[PDB]
């Protein structure tokens, strides 16, 4: 039968032009008074996935 997508990985990764993936940074939901503004400002944009992690992401999203 057809492969089934890991539905929780699809809510966290998106594919880009050359075939990479983008994600949202961690550590910005919670406990924000004690963090510096320089630190929180650098966690706001989006980021790419590293080389060692790509194999685990690709297996979870076969139709992406």
């Amino acid at each position: 039968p057809k492969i089934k997508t890991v539905r929780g990985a699809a809510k966290r990764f998106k594919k880009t032009g050359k075939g990479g993936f983008k994600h949202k940074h961690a550590n910005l939901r919670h406990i924000l008074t004690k963090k510096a503004t320089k630190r929180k400002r650098h966690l706001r944009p989006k980021a790419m996935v590293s080389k060692g992690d790509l194999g685990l992401v690709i297996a979870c999203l076969p139709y992406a």
Binding site: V6, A9, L56, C60
Partner: protein, 96 residues
Amino acid sequence: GFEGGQMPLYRRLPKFGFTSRKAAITAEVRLSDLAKVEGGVVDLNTLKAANIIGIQIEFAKVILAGEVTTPVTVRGLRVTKGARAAIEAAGGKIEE
């Protein structure tokens, strides 16, 4: 996705966004696919009959891709700034 017991990558990262229902009834049209209709008038109904866009598309957008070499007429569609120049240089017209 199993990593031995350590919290895996697709769960220690946060979720983001929402999915838009309007984006699924929208399409884009190239310049090179613009003389493939019949009649010389480019329109939402004539693009479906030429198998260029889907049956439930309600909005369309002509972008700058390829070449157009004949005078054509566009009604009811949106056109980019750079595609409006290439159509008018060939001797075309754009109407709302």
